[model samples]
Target: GLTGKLICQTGIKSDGDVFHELFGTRPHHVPNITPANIQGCDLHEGEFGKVGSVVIWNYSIDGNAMIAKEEIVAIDEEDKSVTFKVVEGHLFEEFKSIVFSVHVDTKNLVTWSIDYEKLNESVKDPTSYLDFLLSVTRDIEAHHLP
Candidate 1:
């Protein structure tokens, strides 16, 4: 009774293809670009840009510490998108399952999608976190604009 999904999009003035490249392959560098929110993203297994790679994200939401361990489950280069399935860490405490996807379209719009099943009704939908992702994209967009 607690399944949910959220999809949000933010338009970036920067190159959308490069945005995909950053999240798809060079996520380790994201912290440097948005250190205030994202502190670290490290590969735990396999490597960036490939499905099955395990990545651990150290980030903050509303300044609250958060961490997630996820595996790259899918990638569509033609669409400049990547999907990740959370396998461990903080999210599992409240969510029975959660999957996140990012798609950057040619128009420079970055879309973030989340599908989740909550452990109980006490748990809330992830709209706040979705807004956090949108704000993070703004930071990245600013970094690319001269």
Candidate 2:
């Protein structure tokens, strides 16, 4: 098995708190921001902000699409951060599992972290997945501007 991690940070213009809050408390709000890639998100279990809550994301990336299931495993309100563990999803196709964390600072700095394990060493890096996330962030930032 091959294990790896990636940490990417980018700047944002939207209200950082609102950006963090959207991902932390209302992932179901995804469709409202970008109806194209994100068709919808729903809580399968637990409340929106609670740990152990599962969110099912129906999305498309570069024409490839599938339903992804992730559970909110950690939250840091002071830092405006949340961590999700991929429990069930097409993400497991090449990788065994993935853990992602999204964090936003008061300065509107956004950080995305991806930790994943591949079933075999032949699997390529997950750059495309990161690109998808970055693109979504840009779309949401645009939609959030006043």
C-alpha TM-score for every candidate: 0.96, 0.95
Candidate 1: clashing pairs of residues? none
The lDDT of each candidate is 0.91, 0.89
Model 1 TM-score on a 0 to 1 scale: 0.96
- After superposing all C-alphas onto the true structure, candidate 2 shows an RMSD in angstroms of 1.1
Q: Put down candidate 2 lDDT per residue, 40-119, tens digits, no spaces.
A: 89889999988899999999987877888999999899989999999998888888989999999874789999999998
Q: Which residue pairs clash in candidate 2?
A: none
Query: Which candidate leads the pack in lDDT?
Result: 1
Best model per TM-score? 1
| TM-score, predicted candidate 2 vs. hidden true structure | 0.95
The local lDDT score (0 to 100) that residue 71 gets in candidate 2 is: 95
lDDT score at residue 69, model 2, on the 0-100 scale:
93
Q: Candidate 2: list runs displaced more than 4 Å.
A: none
Q: What is the lDDT of candidate 2?
A: 0.89
- Encode model 1's per-residue lDDT on 1-146: one tens digit a residue: 89999999878989888889998898889999999889999899998889899999999987789899999998899999999999998899999999999998894789999999999999999788788888789899999887
